[PDB]
């Protein structure tokens with residue numbers, strides 16, 4: 001009973017957070033086995049930030065220019081290397097708290113938990129979606145760079161995001177753990193714009209299934225729709241096209257509720273055309289799009305992790 | 307920048323969660339030093355739930371009846387005791403991961419993080435407010451009882467909630483860690499209902515201040531109101547009366563923004579009377595009341611825990 005935006009338990013990732021300082025800049029790093037991963041702009045001064053030549057700047061650095069602290073312990077840096085927009089600092093000690101992990105690049109519409117960290121110390125946890133303009137709607141202040149986003153499957157932590165920068169109107173951009181940016185962005189202090197954002201249709205449909213599962217049924221109508229006719233309306237309201245893959249992905253939820261996917265699309269189509277008429281769904285007065293189909297199943301069926 | 311509903315990092319609590327089985331009932335317990343805390347109804351059959359005589363039921367229980375697992379390590383129960391609605395199981399092994407902790411009874415209007423667990427394994431984290439009707443808007447399934455709510459101050463975990471039950475409005479009720487229910491609820495299978503609930507006015511104001519700090523400022527206006535006139539309008543909408551102590555508690559956010567509380571109240575009065583005209587505030591189309599002034603200050607100033 002109840003439906004909440006829910007993050008993964010963050011303990012397995014808390015144990016990996018360290019502090020990385022280079023010269024005047026302190027941010028967070030991720031300590032896995034004997035490697036610390038952090039944003040490469042830790043080597044920049046405020047002047048460098050406006051147009052940095054990272055390869056040239058890094059040649060000027062040595063292992064001892066990197067001060068890495070895990071709580072009250074300094075880790076010795078014995079090697080360093082750049083991979084795209086992240087640095088990899090080899091350290092002489094392996095992290096005893098390293099969880100089972102992998103690095104993944106997620107797709108737009110997929111969600112993950114962010115452990116917001118400052119000076120190597122975890123501060124809070126919240127859920128984010130990779131939007132189709134490759135931004136996230138985060139909560140990030142000075143010092144949060146190097147905080148990571150992740151999912152947990154059983155005991156395995158999949159790291160998918162490392163935080164680098166803020167974009168206009170309070171949204172955020174970063175890389176995967178191989179240092180490749182999500183979206184057309186670059187780690188440079190210059191004006192950069194994100195593309196127009198859109199609503200994540202398959203996620204709205206998942207959340208409408210969550211609503212039915214939790215006893216909110218008032219938006220269900222007696223119609224069905226074809227995929228084409230639905231998308232004609234969806235595009236008029238800045239919704240992402242719904243694909244047959246999306247329909248197929250919603251299958252398990254539609255079996256759980258006895259409401260065919262294209263029937264739910266006909267109810268969504270009516271909501272888009274007529275609005276919500278001042279009524280709420282799952283305690284929201286708008287249509288929510290940052291719950292994936294899996295998020296809904298996971299929460300409504302009690303999947304756990306250890 | 308950016309403002310998100312944010313839970314505390316949960317790892318300090320994850321290291322305390324265990325599974326407690328008694329007969330056919332399995333739920334979660336909280337393992338601190340050599341004591342495991344869990345809901346006393348773990349000793350009940352469904353037949354016991356109608357009017358359980360907990361004192362008599364417990365007398366018939368052996369230490370051997372209590373099967374406690376921490377991961378795949380069984381803990382030997384060597385003693386048990388009842389305190390109000392919580393059972394205290396003394397175990398052979400003190401929890402090596404016991405954090406610095408306190409037991410506190412939170413006040414209505416205040417927030418805390420819930421670590422939802424099943425079979426002693428953490429599954430997710432989210433923020434809840436203790437409502438004025440002594441319920442919380444949680445997400446809890448079969449097997450979640452014994453999950454706890456907490457705040458973290460520096461390195462001290464203040465445990466304030468243990469989950470016991472769901473109500474016929476989709477909300478939840480439980481105890482403090484001394485086993486005393488919040489609200490008038492009882493741990494037996496009887497018809498129970500949440501009282502009327504009021505909107506937490508001081509929290510709505512704090513969230514409007516959060517909005518301004520993050521640059522979402524369209525609802526600000528040049529008008530001011532008296533405290534009494536604001537409360538005349540507020541009371542009609544089932545908002546909690548705003549006291550002078552509330553105005554004082556908002557002092558830090560008022561000073562940060564330069565917007566006097568009675569100036570902000572004129573925004574809130576206009577939003578109550580005329581609605582939002584299809585705009586959002588921090589991404590919400592309704593007025594959010596589950597952020598405390600401290601939650602806003604904590605998030606917008608970036609304080610950290612360890």
Ligand SMILES: *[C@](O)(C(=O)NCc1ccccc1)[C@H](C[C@@H]1CCNC1=O)NC(=O)[C@H](CC1CC1)n1cccc(NC(=O)OC(C)(C)C)c1=O
Nearest residue numbers: 041140141142143144145164165166167168187188189307
């Ligand atoms: C990250 O570097 C960080 O946390 N660094 C440690 C630190 C920084 C400053 C002071 C003390 C310690 C920050 C994270 C930012 C901060 C505010 N919100 C965030 O998400 N990243 C940057 O500052 C980033 C670095 C560039 C990519 C390499 N940066 C620099 C300068 C400007 C912006 N953004 C910005 O100005 O956006 C607009 C829309 C123009 C306001 C930026 O992200």
Ligand SMILES: *[C@](O)(C(=O)NCc1ccccc1)[C@H](C[C@@H]1CCNC1=O)NC(=O)[C@H](CC1CC1)n1cccc(NC(=O)OC(C)(C)C)c1=O
Nearest residue numbers: 333347446447448449450451470471472473474493494495
């Ligand atoms: C908690 O006891 C628990 O999780 N126990 C272990 C377990 C239970 C069931 C199956 C396997 C394992 C549950 C938590 C509830 C369950 C679903 N969501 C929750 O939040 N608590 C209860 O069942 C509670 C126990 C009473 C306090 C001692 N209980 C009993 C009887 C009735 C209700 N409520 C209820 O019927 O609510 C409605 C909305 C009317 C369905 C109740 O919580």
